[PDB]
RNA sequence: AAAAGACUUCA
RNA sequence: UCCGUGAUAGUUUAAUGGUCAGAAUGGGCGCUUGUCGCGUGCCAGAUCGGGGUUCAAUUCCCCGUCGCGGAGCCA
RNA sequence: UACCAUGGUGGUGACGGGUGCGGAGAAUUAGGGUUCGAUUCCGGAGAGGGAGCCUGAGAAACGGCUACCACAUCCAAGGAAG
RNA sequence: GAGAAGUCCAUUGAACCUUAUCAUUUAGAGGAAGCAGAAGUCGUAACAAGGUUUCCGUAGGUGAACCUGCGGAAGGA
RNA sequence: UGCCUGAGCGGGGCGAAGCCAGAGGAAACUCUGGUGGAGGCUCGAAGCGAUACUGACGUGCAAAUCGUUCGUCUGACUUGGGUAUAGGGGCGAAAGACUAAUCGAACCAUCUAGUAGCUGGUUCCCUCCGAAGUUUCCCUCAGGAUAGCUGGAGCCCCGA
RNA sequence: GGAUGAACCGGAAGCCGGGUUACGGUGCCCAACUGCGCGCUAACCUAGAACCCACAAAGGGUGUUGGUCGAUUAAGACAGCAGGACGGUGGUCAUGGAAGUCGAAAUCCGCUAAGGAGUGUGUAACAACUCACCUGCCGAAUCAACUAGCCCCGAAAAUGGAUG
RNA sequence: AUGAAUGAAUUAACGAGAUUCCCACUGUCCCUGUCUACUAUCCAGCGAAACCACAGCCAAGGGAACGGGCUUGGCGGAAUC
RNA sequence: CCACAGGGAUUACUGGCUUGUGGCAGCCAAGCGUUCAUAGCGACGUUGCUUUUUGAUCCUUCGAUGUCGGCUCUUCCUAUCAUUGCGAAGCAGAAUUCACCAAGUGUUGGAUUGUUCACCCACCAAUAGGGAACGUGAGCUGGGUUUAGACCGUCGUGAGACAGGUUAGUUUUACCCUACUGAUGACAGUGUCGCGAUAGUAAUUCAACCUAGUACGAGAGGAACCGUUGAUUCACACAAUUGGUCAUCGCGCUGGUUGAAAAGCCAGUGGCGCGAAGCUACCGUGUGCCGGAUUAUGACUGAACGCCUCUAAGUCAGAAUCCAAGC
RNA sequence: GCCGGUCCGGCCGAAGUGCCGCGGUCGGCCCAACGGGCGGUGGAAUCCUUUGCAGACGAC
């Protein structure tokens, strides 16, 4: 069976087009002290021949700190993608996009590793990760 | 290995092959839903022509997940589905060589419809009074011949089928005047009752409203849009080959291995693409109606609002829908102005899928693109116009 | 007018 | 990996005609000198491992471990 | 601010750089100097950083505004708010 | 006769980004061996005319202390 | 490659000699403004060169071409004509580069019908018999040589 | 003739004609037997002298047949089912502990028609049931052991199945 | 198996020279699309070469051990674009 | 720096034979695992299978078999990494450990290196191995190997040499046959609607919720079946929407030109900036099943052999696999 | 009496394909399954022209 484990979510509820591949650099939406991440992997995608793993809004990610906390430059840490510039399509049928591509850095428990957010979170991520949600100042 | 290495699913299906011209322009079912319901009032299929696509808002249903109850959009194909003439009852025998038709009983009236049936169908374009179709016997001499045929048919237990055609001058967007002939099986209860109901159904037309209920799960069958001839990338979904430049660009490398010194059938190679037969299953039939004169349409504030099923200005390269109509969920095979045939869902469990219907909120109607919504908008445009609107 | 060098630390 | 080339005392390094093995330095013992050192007398090797030929093999063959040099094309 | 003249300053230190408010005064030490320059008295200056303005005899205003930025705050989270 | 919202030209004339460079706090590419502790090796230079009298400018060059060529000095026989 | 004698290099940038003013110092010479412009100098036109697509072409437009890119461009530069040096010789900022599509020794014609233990081929019928692929020698082993294996033509009348 | 096949078999060939044969073969393809007497195999083993070409081993197999030898049998077997076992004495050693039942003496008898100091199940240890031997019910062959055949097993490969 | 004019070390400027890192950017890439041009295609006209012992199905097998053809099996309506 | 005559009479090299070497297996089971050969581990010895490493040979080619590695594209094997169903355990849950059936579908994305291989990183359900002339140059690529230039080290008196390193260093052809993909296309009394012998294959997998903080458990932890939601991957399709394009067509702004504004030209095949139907994909948006027979196995009835026995005669179930369902 | 085409109709037949009977007529005790004629009597499509849902041509 699965070597463990947890994380890979529940039904998001909406449709997202992938915007951040491997090696993409991304805003850190917390005050952990990290202030630019680099994405290396997604908890649960499987790819193929010649093609990049890409991640999106609601993915649980591992990312490494290109700028940021002392615990952080050049640590490799878990993260969640909170915002993206490439459109998401809701059940109603509206398309949402954000100004920035942003994630928060996360505990193996799925809580934030920082005291407070910066910027909005999509409610879809907040549903999925409710201990990211209960740090979020604004929910869209 | 041998190689390599880093290995892939193979592009473009083998159950969807040969990727080749279809033999006739109008789709053809090789099998039907089972006799498990009412007699041959249940014709097992109906036809229409694809007008375009529109869109709907509905009050939904589910409850398990986060978004729920409540308004949603879902996407819609509009088909014009005018009433179709069931002309004759065709008697199929079970034989150990397959089914064989025996004799056919005909209504008193197909009569521009058989002249259209003689147009590719047969040939030479219907000008001063020709091709010829045979006339009916002396009435009740020919009805006793036919009722002696009914006797053999309704003693030896025929698997009942219907010849029907589309009376096409009830569509407008194919400006064309020609009938399209089809074989539709008739399914139902016991075989004698099934012949009787098929008899009472050829001596008068059948609309969509007598074969499909609104919400019902329908398998839709058509022939794809044609491309012409193509290479492998746009015909089987293979990669472009990358370097800046290359003495072959959109190419397969080898079309085999050294052995087999003979190119296999399964390799992705160029050829024709499109104009392929397809059956596309389990389509939820969101509305059937008429422009009016059946409904009404939708309701004033609220449920939801009145919208004639055209986008104004017409469906691009089709026309205006203004007759009998069928709104089918999502995609439906073909271009625009092609024969599409609709059949009750084959997968008897019988189940979910759909079950419950799903209040029509919006059709779309549009009115959008720089202007809209209808009525008050058209008034507002006319105020700014004003001699050319 | 001279062959030939060394020689532990603190007291 | 092929053709060439060596080894002798602690260490660096001479040598034979088949009967015979050295040097220098280093070291061991005395004397210098108050004491060390500079200097001065005295001393001390299974000739790499290995088998064979012969009256007699450090010396003449064959093998091998090591350290050396020199080659190894047209892909 | 126009136009005309090309200047004016500095081997008696101009222009520039650094400096863990200036004076009245404090501390020393026999005197000389050294040191210190501040909280107080006096004059000047600034009110999170910076420019501008109304009002009023007088402000270029800590207890007024405008408003960019910096940073906390309120939220029935629209907007206010220091 | 007063003259609201207001829109334009001109001026004093904010803040982010455009410079380019200098300064401060810093870290730091890579690198030289100046002093030092006593517990080290090398030689025995200087120290008595130091066993070749010292020191000195100057170049050369040496394991190094240094050596010596040239000229100068007596803090020298 | 040399020699002779001609010709060609838009325009722009940077700013060496050293001297004026202004100013300093006893002098020495110095500071700041400023002028002028040196250069196998810089960015680049005519002109030269030929880096990249490892593109286009590859029975071509072409027996080394085309497009776009890239380097040099007042210099040991480029180039027209008149012109030296000729075959183990010339010329070479020397790669074995270049000497008329031919260069680790040009081309032509001749010697010449070179020479090849090597490859290829060698053209009418039939009959009688019918192989060797072994042995010694041999700079001998892709050949020679000498028997061995054969066959014809004659002569004679034992042999397991 | 051997599917094909330089060298295996038959056979050494002038041409032709007819006859009979060799090797090898006789269900069809393919002339000619769906030949006779008997026996084994059911795995499609398997249609095969020889072959780079046709694989199959060590080892195993109550599959099945067959041969043989010993012992046991109507003075009643083998198996199954059912039924009998008092006392010496809670067997001597040894050891928390054997005491039928961890390990190790030792295995006799009175009282008896049969009746072992016991065959496997026990609880820390103490706690019961069966069983040796003997008997009934049943009725006919049983058991041991050597030997041999075939088959079975060991037995996984690459474009598509065959002994042609 | 470094080493001093068989030059050692070192080094500013210069470079279509070799390797590496960063920012900027981007279709190289995720992953492909539409679109232009000239080709293509079709028409009239002009009109070639290479090459050619060979008829020209597949799967197996065999064979000088890599068969378009032998052998057994299996398939094939020609011709033409 | 080469050249010539030849040879597959002889190498490298692909192929073929072999299979010591390599890979994998069986047997036996000393022994280890607290006690226990066989939960697991397992030596010596021994028999094999494969042909995919290496070696050997010299059969094939030297009037020419294009090299390694890579890419893409088709197909396969099974000695199965995952997924399905299983058996055992030193399987309390539970992570697991070993093994059986089984090839349907999956088997990834990156950092160093030309690398194959391998090391590393996060992923994943797991990121299996092995053939198809080391599949694949009349496809590509061209980094290594492997020409001519040159440097270094080593060797050599030297020319020059090295399984020693380094920088640079070319990829020809218009398809006759055949093969398949795709379009045509006579005979027969006609066109059309059909049947369906037969031929191809389509769905794979995951996460989470219900159950349940339950079972099981001292506790710590922590399951199942359906029932529900959604998404990875694949397939088909459409284009309402969102996203691209939009060299129909209409606008801003040059430079230069038609005297001048006005209306136009050229600057690419659209001067540049702005945007549509149609076509398309940013995973845009829609659509992807019970029964029958089996394997391993777990059972029923049951003899040979009165008992026992899952099978031998018979039978009940049982895999993502087979057949059907279905295109 | 026994047979062979026939008028008129039924059963496998559900096609191709056949058979078997109530009342009589041409006949007995060559050419079936195909055809090839000398003769009597009697009752459509391609193109075109303009287009496409289609499309390299052809096709649709």
Set out the fold topology.
This is part of a larger assembly, with chains A (140 residues) and B (389 residues).
Chain A: E1 15-16, E2 20-21, E3 25-28, E4 37-42, E5 54-55, E6 60-65, E7 76-83, E8 88-89, E9 95-96, E10 102-105, H1 123-128, H2 130-133
Parallel strand pairs in A: 3-10
Antiparallel strand pairs in A: 1-8, 2-5, 3-4, 4-6, 6-7, 7-10, 8-9
Chain B: E1 45-58, E2 72-80, E3 84-93, E4 100-106, H1 113-116, H2 139-156, E5 159-166, E6 180-185, H3 191-202, E7 217-223, E8 226-230, E9 271-274, E10 277-284, E11 287-290, E12 324-329, E13 339-344, E14 360-363, H4 376-383
Antiparallel strand pairs in B: 1-2, 1-13, 1-14, 2-12, 3-4, 3-5, 5-6, 7-10, 7-13, 8-9, 11-12
The structure holds 9 RNA strands.
Strand content of chain B: 25-35%
User: Termini separation of chain A (Å)?
Assistant: 38 Å
Strand content of chain A: 25-35%
The largest pleated sheet of chain B is described as:
8 strands, antiparallel
- The amount of helix of chain A comes to under 10%
Shape of chain B: globular
Oligomer status? part of a larger assembly
The largest β sheet of chain A comes out as: 5 strands, mixed, barrel
Tell me which protein chains meet in the greatest interface and how many residues each side has.
Answer: A-B, 11 and 11 residues
Structural class of chain B: alpha+beta
**Number of E-type strands of chain B:** 14
How many β-strands of chain A, per DSSP? 10
State the helicity of chain B in percent bands: 10-25%
Strand order of the largest sheet of chain A: 3-4-6-7-10
User: Which value, in Å, is the CA radius of gyration of chain B?
Assistant: 25 Å
**Judging from the principal axes of the Cα atoms, what is the shape of chain A?**
globular
SSE order of chain B in H/E notation?
Answer: EEEEHHEEHEEEEEEEEH
Q: Counting H and I runs of at least 4 residues, what is the number of helices of chain A?
A: 2
The whole-angstrom Rg of chain A is 14 Å
In N-to-C order, the SSE pattern of chain A is EEEEEEEEEEHH
Family (chain B): Belongs to the universal ribosomal protein uL3 family.
Protein name (chain B): Ribosomal protein L3
Binding site for Mg(2+) 1 (chain B): 30
Modified residues (Tele-methylhistidine) (chain B): 246
């Amino acid at each position: 069976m699965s070597k463990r484990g947890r994380g890979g979510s529940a039904g998001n509820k909406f449709r997202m087009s992938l915007g951040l591949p491997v090696a993409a650099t991304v805003n850190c939406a917390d005050n952990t002290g990290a202030k630019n991440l680099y994405i290396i992997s997604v908890k649960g995608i499987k790819g193929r021949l010649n093609r990049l793993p890409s991640a999106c809004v609601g993915d649980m990610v591992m990312a490494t700190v290109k700028k940021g906390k002392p615990d952080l430059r050049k640590k490799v840490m878990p993260a969640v993608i909170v915002r993206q510039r490439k459109p998401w399509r809701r059940k109603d049928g509206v398309f949402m996009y954000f100004e920035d591509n942003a994630g928060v850095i996360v505990n193996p428990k799925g809580e934030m590793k920082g005291s407070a957010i910066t910027g909005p979170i999509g409610k879809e991520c907040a549903d999925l990760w409710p201990r990211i949600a209960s740090a979020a100042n604004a929910i869209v | 290995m041998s190689h390599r290495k880093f290995e892939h699913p193979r592009h473009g299906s083998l159950g969807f092959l040969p990727r080749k011209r279809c033999s006739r322009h109008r789709g053809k079912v090789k099998s039907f839903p089972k006799d498990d319901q009412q007699k041959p009032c249940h014709l097992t299929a109906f036809l229409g022509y694809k007008a375009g696509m529109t869109h709907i808002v509905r009050e939904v249903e589910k409850p398990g997940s986060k978004l729920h109850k409540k308004e949603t959009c879902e996407a819609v194909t509009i088909i014009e589905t005018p009433p179709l003439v069931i002309v004759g009852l065709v008697a199929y025998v079970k034989t150990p060589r397959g089914l064989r038709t025996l004799n056919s009983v005909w209504a008193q009236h197909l009569s521009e419809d058989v002249r259209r049936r003689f147009y590719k169908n047969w040939c030479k374009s219907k000008k001063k009074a020709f091709t010829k179709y045979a006339l009916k016997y002396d009435s009740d001499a020919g009805k006793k011949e036919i009722q002696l045929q009914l006797e053999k048919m309704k003693k030896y237990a025929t698997i009942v089928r219907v010849i029907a055609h589309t009376q096409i001058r009830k569509m407008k967007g194919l400006k064309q005047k020609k009938a399209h002939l089809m074989e539709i099986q008739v399914n139902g209860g016991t075989i004698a009752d099934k012949v009787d109901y098929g008899y009472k159904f050829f001596e008068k037309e059948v609309p969509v409203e007598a074969v499909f209920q609104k919400d019902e799960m329908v398998d839709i069958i058509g022939v794809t849009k044609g491309k012409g001839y193509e290479g492998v990338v746009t015909r089987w979904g293979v990669t472009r080959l990358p370097r800046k430049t290359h003495r072959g660009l959109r190419k397969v490398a080898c079309i085999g291995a050294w052995h087999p010194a003979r190119v296999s059938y399964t390799v992705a190679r160029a050829g024709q693409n499109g104009y392929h037969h397809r059956t596309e299953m389990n389509k939820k039939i969101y509305k059937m109606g008429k422009s009016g004169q059946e409904s009404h349409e939708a309701c004033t504030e609220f449920d939801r609002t009145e919208k004639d099923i055209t986008p104004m200005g017409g469906f691009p390269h089709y026309g205006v829908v203004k007759g009998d109509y069928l709104m089918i969920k999502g995609c439906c095979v073909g271009p625009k102005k092609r024969v599409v045939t609709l059949r009750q869902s084959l997968l008897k469990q019988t189940s979910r899928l759909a079950l419950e219907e799903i209040k029509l909120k919006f059709i779309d109607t549009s009115s959008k693109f720089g202007h809209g919504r209808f009525q008050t908008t058209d008034e507002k445009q006319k105020f700014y116009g004003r001699l050319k609107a």
